[PDB]
Design an enzyme around this catalytic site. Sequence first.
Site, PDB file in Angstrom:
ATOM      1  CD  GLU A 133      -6.061   2.032  -6.573  1.00  0.00           C
ATOM      2  OE1 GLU A 133      -6.643   0.951  -6.286  1.00  0.00           O
ATOM      3  OE2 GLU A 133      -6.037   3.037  -5.813  1.00  0.00           O
TER       4      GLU A 133
ATOM      5  NE  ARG B   7       2.599   0.625   3.489  1.00  0.00           N
ATOM      6  CZ  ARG B   7       3.774   0.026   3.644  1.00  0.00           C
ATOM      7  NH1 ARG B   7       4.132  -0.422   4.839  1.00  0.00           N
ATOM      8  NH2 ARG B   7       4.601  -0.111   2.605  1.00  0.00           N
TER       9      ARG B   7
ATOM     10  CB  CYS C 140      -0.914   0.029   1.227  1.00  0.00           C
ATOM     11  SG  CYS C 140      -1.900   1.545   1.386  1.00  0.00           S
TER      12      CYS C 140
HETATM   13  C1  HEM Z   1      -6.247   6.595   1.997  1.00  0.00           C
HETATM   14  C2  HEM Z   1      -6.120   6.256   0.696  1.00  0.00           C
HETATM   15  C3  HEM Z   1      -5.429   5.045   0.195  1.00  0.00           C
HETATM   16  C4  HEM Z   1      -4.772   4.966  -0.982  1.00  0.00           C
HETATM   17  C5  HEM Z   1      -4.643   6.099  -1.992  1.00  0.00           C
HETATM   18  C6  HEM Z   1      -4.256   3.644  -1.110  1.00  0.00           C
HETATM   19  C7  HEM Z   1      -3.549   3.201  -2.226  1.00  0.00           C
HETATM   20  C8  HEM Z   1      -3.377   1.837  -2.468  1.00  0.00           C
HETATM   21  C9  HEM Z   1      -3.066   1.289  -3.742  1.00  0.00           C
HETATM   22  C10 HEM Z   1      -2.920   2.073  -5.027  1.00  0.00           C
HETATM   23  C11 HEM Z   1      -2.952  -0.061  -3.615  1.00  0.00           C
HETATM   24  C12 HEM Z   1      -2.654  -1.059  -4.726  1.00  0.00           C
HETATM   25  C13 HEM Z   1      -3.992  -1.701  -5.150  1.00  0.00           C
HETATM   26  C14 HEM Z   1      -4.022  -2.425  -6.472  1.00  0.00           C
HETATM   27  O1  HEM Z   1      -3.148  -2.206  -7.347  1.00  0.00           O
HETATM   28  O2  HEM Z   1      -4.961  -3.249  -6.693  1.00  0.00           O
HETATM   29  C15 HEM Z   1      -3.182  -0.356  -2.248  1.00  0.00           C
HETATM   30  C16 HEM Z   1      -3.079  -1.638  -1.764  1.00  0.00           C
HETATM   31  C17 HEM Z   1      -3.491  -1.895  -0.471  1.00  0.00           C
HETATM   32  N1  HEM Z   1      -3.958  -1.008   0.454  1.00  0.00           N
HETATM   33 FE1  HEM Z   1      -4.043   0.919   0.374  1.00  0.00          FE
HETATM   34  N2  HEM Z   1      -4.592   2.909  -0.051  1.00  0.00           N
HETATM   35  C18 HEM Z   1      -5.282   3.693   0.818  1.00  0.00           C
HETATM   36  C19 HEM Z   1      -5.880   3.344   2.033  1.00  0.00           C
HETATM   37  C20 HEM Z   1      -5.873   2.061   2.594  1.00  0.00           C
HETATM   38  C21 HEM Z   1      -6.552   1.642   3.754  1.00  0.00           C
HETATM   39  C22 HEM Z   1      -7.435   2.549   4.590  1.00  0.00           C
HETATM   40  C23 HEM Z   1      -6.224   0.301   4.007  1.00  0.00           C
HETATM   41  C24 HEM Z   1      -6.684  -0.587   5.119  1.00  0.00           C
HETATM   42  C25 HEM Z   1      -7.078  -0.163   6.338  1.00  0.00           C
HETATM   43  C26 HEM Z   1      -5.373  -0.116   2.924  1.00  0.00           C
HETATM   44  C27 HEM Z   1      -4.796  -1.370   2.792  1.00  0.00           C
HETATM   45  C28 HEM Z   1      -4.249  -1.766   1.548  1.00  0.00           C
HETATM   46  C29 HEM Z   1      -3.984  -3.189   1.290  1.00  0.00           C
HETATM   47  C30 HEM Z   1      -4.183  -4.353   2.236  1.00  0.00           C
HETATM   48  C31 HEM Z   1      -3.523  -3.287   0.029  1.00  0.00           C
HETATM   49  C32 HEM Z   1      -3.095  -4.574  -0.664  1.00  0.00           C
HETATM   50  C33 HEM Z   1      -4.232  -5.251  -1.434  1.00  0.00           C
HETATM   51  C34 HEM Z   1      -3.803  -6.555  -2.085  1.00  0.00           C
HETATM   52  O3  HEM Z   1      -2.761  -7.170  -1.752  1.00  0.00           O
HETATM   53  O4  HEM Z   1      -4.536  -7.038  -2.978  1.00  0.00           O
HETATM   54  N3  HEM Z   1      -5.156   0.994   2.126  1.00  0.00           N
HETATM   55  N4  HEM Z   1      -3.415   0.819  -1.535  1.00  0.00           N
HETATM   56  N1  LIG Z   2      -8.260 -14.646  -4.021  1.00  0.00           N
HETATM   57  C1  LIG Z   2      -7.086 -14.367  -3.642  1.00  0.00           C
HETATM   58  N2  LIG Z   2      -6.544 -13.156  -3.821  1.00  0.00           N
HETATM   59  C2  LIG Z   2      -6.665 -12.357  -4.912  1.00  0.00           C
HETATM   60  C3  LIG Z   2      -6.813 -12.874  -6.198  1.00  0.00           C
HETATM   61  C4  LIG Z   2      -6.918 -11.999  -7.277  1.00  0.00           C
HETATM   62  C5  LIG Z   2      -6.863 -10.619  -7.077  1.00  0.00           C
HETATM   63  C6  LIG Z   2      -6.706 -10.092  -5.796  1.00  0.00           C
HETATM   64  C7  LIG Z   2      -6.638  -8.587  -5.587  1.00  0.00           C
HETATM   65  O1  LIG Z   2      -6.722  -7.951  -6.868  1.00  0.00           O
HETATM   66  C8  LIG Z   2      -6.133  -6.648  -6.977  1.00  0.00           C
HETATM   67  C9  LIG Z   2      -5.625  -6.417  -8.407  1.00  0.00           C
HETATM   68  N3  LIG Z   2      -5.072  -5.057  -8.628  1.00  0.00           N
HETATM   69  C10 LIG Z   2      -7.193  -5.609  -6.696  1.00  0.00           C
HETATM   70  O2  LIG Z   2      -7.153  -5.211  -5.334  1.00  0.00           O
HETATM   71  C11 LIG Z   2      -8.096  -4.164  -5.176  1.00  0.00           C
HETATM   72  C12 LIG Z   2      -7.526  -3.152  -4.213  1.00  0.00           C
HETATM   73  C13 LIG Z   2      -6.865  -3.583  -3.067  1.00  0.00           C
HETATM   74  C14 LIG Z   2      -6.353  -2.639  -2.171  1.00  0.00           C
HETATM   75  C15 LIG Z   2      -6.492  -1.289  -2.462  1.00  0.00           C
HETATM   76  C16 LIG Z   2      -7.175  -0.847  -3.602  1.00  0.00           C
HETATM   77  N4  LIG Z   2      -7.311   0.483  -3.912  1.00  0.00           N
HETATM   78  C17 LIG Z   2      -7.580   1.427  -3.015  1.00  0.00           C
HETATM   79  N5  LIG Z   2      -7.209   2.643  -3.185  1.00  0.00           N
HETATM   80  C18 LIG Z   2      -8.292   0.974  -1.795  1.00  0.00           C
HETATM   81  C19 LIG Z   2      -9.321   0.051  -1.524  1.00  0.00           C
HETATM   82  C20 LIG Z   2      -9.559  -0.022  -0.149  1.00  0.00           C
HETATM   83  C21 LIG Z   2      -8.767   0.796   0.675  1.00  0.00           C
HETATM   84  S1  LIG Z   2      -7.676   1.678  -0.359  1.00  0.00           S
HETATM   85  C22 LIG Z   2      -7.690  -1.794  -4.480  1.00  0.00           C
HETATM   86  C23 LIG Z   2      -6.603 -10.973  -4.723  1.00  0.00           C
HETATM   87  C24 LIG Z   2      -6.251 -15.389  -2.947  1.00  0.00           C
HETATM   88  C25 LIG Z   2      -4.914 -15.762  -3.051  1.00  0.00           C
HETATM   89  C26 LIG Z   2      -4.567 -16.785  -2.155  1.00  0.00           C
HETATM   90  C27 LIG Z   2      -5.589 -17.250  -1.321  1.00  0.00           C
HETATM   91  S2  LIG Z   2      -7.012 -16.338  -1.717  1.00  0.00           S
HETATM   92 CL   LIG Z   3     -10.285  -1.262  -7.898  1.00  0.00          CL
END
Ligand code: HEM
Ligand SMILES: N=C(Nc1cccc(CO[C@@H](CN)COCc2cccc(/N=C(/N)c3cccs3)c2)c1)c1cccs1
Ligand SMILES: [Cl-]
Lengths: 362, 362
Positions: A242, A68, A65
């Site tokens: 995104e 953060r 992320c």
């Molecule tokens: C405040 C604005 C926020 C921005 C701009 C931001 C930005 C991002 C971006 C761009 C990603 C990559 C997502 C992707 O390519 O699919 C990401 C991943 C992530 N963000 Fe953030 N984020 C924010 C807030 C948060 C919050 C509030 C949380 C949780 C409390 C969070 C937890 C995560 C997690 C867990 C991922 C990894 C998702 C994965 O592995 O699929 N983020 N964030």
């Molecule tokens: N199903 C699985 N995982 C999985 C499979 C396919 C895709 C994904 C996640 O896909 C990402 C591809 N870019 C999309 O994630 C969406 C995402 C996650 C976190 C932040 C995102 N964007 C933001 N700005 C926020 C969303 C919420 C807070 S910030 C978007 C996860 C597993 C793997 C192993 C056991 S289960």
């Molecule tokens: Cl999305």
Amino acid sequence: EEKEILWNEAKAFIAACYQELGKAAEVKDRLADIKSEIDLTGSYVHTKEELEHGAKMAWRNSNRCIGRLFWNSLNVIDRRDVRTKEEVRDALFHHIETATNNGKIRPTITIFPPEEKGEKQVEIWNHQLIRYAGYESDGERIGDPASCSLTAACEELGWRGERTDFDLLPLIFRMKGDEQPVWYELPRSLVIEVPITHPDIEAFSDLELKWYGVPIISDMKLEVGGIHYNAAPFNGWYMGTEIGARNLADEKRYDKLKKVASVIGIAADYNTDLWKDQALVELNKAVLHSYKKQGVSIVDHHTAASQFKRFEEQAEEAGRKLTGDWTWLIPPISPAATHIFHRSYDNSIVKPNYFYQDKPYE
Amino acid sequence: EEKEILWNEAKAFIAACYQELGKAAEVKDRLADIKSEIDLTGSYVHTKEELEHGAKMAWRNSNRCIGRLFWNSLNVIDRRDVRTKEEVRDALFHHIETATNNGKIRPTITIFPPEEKGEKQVEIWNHQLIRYAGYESDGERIGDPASCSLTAACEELGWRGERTDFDLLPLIFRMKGDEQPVWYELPRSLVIEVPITHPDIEAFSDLELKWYGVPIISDMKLEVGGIHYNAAPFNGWYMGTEIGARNLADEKRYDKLKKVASVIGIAADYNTDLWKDQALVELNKAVLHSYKKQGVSIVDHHTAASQFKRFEEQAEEAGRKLTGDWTWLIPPISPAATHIFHRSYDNSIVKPNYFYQDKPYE
Ligand code: HEM
Ligand SMILES: N=C(Nc1cccc(CO[C@@H](CN)COCc2cccc(/N=C(/N)c3cccs3)c2)c1)c1cccs1
Ligand SMILES: [Cl-]
Ligand code: HEM
Ligand SMILES: N=C(Nc1cccc(CO[C@@H](CN)COCc2cccc(/N=C(/N)c3cccs3)c2)c1)c1cccs1
Ligand SMILES: C[C@H](O)[C@H](O)[C@H]1CNc2nc(N)[nH]c(=O)c2N1
Ligand SMILES: C[C@H](O)[C@H](O)[C@H]1CNc2nc(N)[nH]c(=O)c2N1
Ligand SMILES: [Cl-]
């Protein structure tokens, strides 16, 4: 064994959490209380302080992320009290409303009762609370292909999509004790959407693109001190890439680059013309412009990386190890224009954290 | 110990090399010859076949290289016979001439005598055979900052740059037995340069940018079967992003994005305008256009990744493990528009290969 894991995870979390909160002298008594509770019940219950700080630490520890910097301002909503599907629905509706905040997005997490012995109390099927349906028949695709399997599962439960390119999926979740999930249509008044227009090119509206305002991830497990909150949806705001470089651009998503090329008036014939790159830049400018014009929060990738730089400096100043996943932190456009590209990151997993879990469908 | 390492590396290389060349039945006798030679001399000499195939395998094994589809057409020039600095100079001049091939670039490597017991026979100081000088005084930079330290070392040896932004560094290398390297100015008739113009924007020539046609890496060690060829300069052709997204764009290189923004007529004031991204696209279009117009080989990043996809398919068809470094294979612009971004690669080190070695200056 499971019980030992819990206690060891609990010890580590309470010590670190209470240290951060200036409560170090209370660790000993709290750990005593916990061991007894584990000994008798096979588990333990977090105080509201522990749960709140735990969710924030989990965000701070999310290697992938870029957002953060703002981890400490997370709004934590404690819904461990829910017992009925109406209460879950209303809690999810509330999350959407309060996170959306009329466009001035508030990073928020709603936390539902945790797993007991690996048995879920509430099981959310949606990937995000607000997302578009996807369909495939006849060779031709409609909507978001990433939603194809969940859309098909919803249509097994009596729901039917209109088959536009932007059908909102219903909320879908299962309660402990029920064999099938229930589904509820989203009230449209709760869902802000943004039409995509370009600041200089009038024809861009001909694409009729839109996206939803608030991404709310609802299928990850929050783990805190050995307790597994499998149902804890969270949201921030979007980084523009995104939407513009992935959701609308990927060939296996909405695949719009050739149509973008056409309305911006360039040929899409030769790799050497870099028409895909040019289309990507104009589509990403349109996304940022449109969110800003609508009064919906969004961050561009340059500003986001600058914020992440401050997060790195904050960690070093606080004496905290920084962890990160370079392959996800780099933005998908102009990555070498950010400082992220030019340094390296330790990808170690630190808990509390958010984790993938198996889908109940597929 | 050193001797055992050599023999083990020799065994592995000869077996694999001879297998690939359909010479498997000759391995036993060749390995006998080698062990005796090692036993008596502490080393062994490659046949021309071994050296040639070894250099090609080394390229095929370079995890960071997107251009590997063409590994088998490498032109290997064997110069293990050189003994004098005039012979080295003339061999380096020849490499430039034959690799350049009037603009139709031929991937080429020239191989000099290898280290004996870690003692170099020829030590090349240049990073690339053709590269621009860099200077810093008075706070203001001139030329290529990446060349600052080598430029300073050359000016310790009696050379003096004109202090334009594009001074060609001389060849500089040291012979075994000499305390100081010698230097030789490059004949300008051997060096093709390309002025950077844009296909549609006439003002772009106002930047007065140029780059050299042929990148010839001259500071890596080729290792083949335990033999260390520390001096073995090699070249391919450029992928356009190397010039347009890095050499001319990086803040610590030529840093031209603000000036590009100005001549293409956009503001460079707001991150949300994505002016850096737009500038990067137009600068990269100009680089490809200009090389093509001049009749100098170059590949765009989309075509390069398509070629790399064929390399992956070729490996799978041949039953060879594929290794790669995702962080270097992704291009620095529109990386998610290539297939590379969406898969993963095993970054294991396999020999023969090309390796970094310590600089003799700094
Ligand atoms: C405040 C604005 C926020 C921005 C701009 C931001 C930005 C991002 C971006 C761009 C990603 C990559 C997502 C992707 O390519 O699919 C990401 C991943 C992530 N963000 Fe953030 N984020 C924010 C807030 C948060 C919050 C509030 C949380 C949780 C409390 C969070 C937890 C995560 C997690 C867990 C991922 C990894 C998702 C994965 O592995 O699929 N983020 N964030
Ligand atoms: N199903 C699985 N995982 C999985 C499979 C396919 C895709 C994904 C996640 O896909 C990402 C591809 N870019 C999309 O994630 C969406 C995402 C996650 C976190 C932040 C995102 N964007 C933001 N700005 C926020 C969303 C919420 C807070 S910030 C978007 C996860 C597993 C793997 C192993 C056991 S289960
Ligand atoms: Cl999305
Ligand atoms: C034929 C055209 C070729 C193209 C288009 C090509 C493309 C590239 C590119 C873009 C890089 C990344 C460089 C950077 O970002 O600094 C690279 C790295 C590399 N290439 Fe190739 N390449 C080609 C030929 C060759 C040849 C002929 C060899 C050796 C025989 C070679 C060996 C390597 C090595 C060793 C690296 C890694 C350099 C490092 O780690 O610093 N390539 N290649
Ligand atoms: N000095 C070191 N290494 C090192 C330090 C700083 C930089 C570098 C390499 O810098 C690269 C930054 N992008 C530049 O490499 C230039 C390069 C390499 C390979 C291919 C390149 N481009 C082409 N198309 C070709 C050039 C030759 C054949 S293809 C360019 C190497 C050491 C590390 C450890 C011990 S020594
Ligand atoms: C820290 C990071 O790994 C480093 O900046 C790399 C990233 N990927 C790269 N990729 C290529 N092709 N060339 C480079 O110089 C770099 N720099
Ligand atoms: C294979 C590769 O690691 C995968 O495609 C990743 C690359 N980096 C990414 N980075 C982000 N932010 N989001 C993603 O979905 C991906 N996909
Ligand atoms: Cl270069």
